[PDB]
Amino acid sequence: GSDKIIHLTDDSFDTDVLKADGAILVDFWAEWCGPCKMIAPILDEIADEYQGKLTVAKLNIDQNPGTAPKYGIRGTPTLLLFKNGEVAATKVGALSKGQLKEFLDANLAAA
């Protein structure tokens, strides 16, 4: 995976995400997950391409069972875009690089 991705834990979520200075896109994922597997390389490219405008983060739900229920996540992958501690947009399921780009470009700009 990209070395630019922040791997979050249950204990680090509040500090890493809600206290972040800028936008953080959070990937809720798991080992046995076709769709998680499919957006992974896509996310790597976004981390590279959106550096300075966004930080990509991962929450592994096998290793961190607590955070996902708090945020209404009912499946994986689910992407949550955070801004100054606020969930600002949500995307469930696999998507294309093109779809993820349009979602981010639309949502990063909205304040």
Side-chain angles (χ1 to χ4, degrees), residues 32-52 54-96 98-100:
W32 291 94
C33 180
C36 313
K37 207 93 170 195
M38 297 189 285
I39 65 168
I42 296 176
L43 292 164
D44 286 334
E45 293 167 23
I46 270 69
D48 288 348
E49 293 167 13
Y50 283 78
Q51 209 200 341
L54 168 77
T55 305
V56 174
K58 280 185 187 175
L59 189 64
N60 183 328
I61 63 161
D62 308 321
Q63 292 177 351
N64 303 271
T67 310
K70 312 196 294 185
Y71 285 90
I73 307 290
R74 287 207 74 160
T76 67
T78 302
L79 300 153
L80 291 180
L81 188 60
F82 285 82
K83 267 149 164 259
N84 308 302
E86 80 176 295
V87 178
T90 303
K91 249 272 191 272
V92 178
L95 67 176
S96 73
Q99 285 181 305
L100 178 60

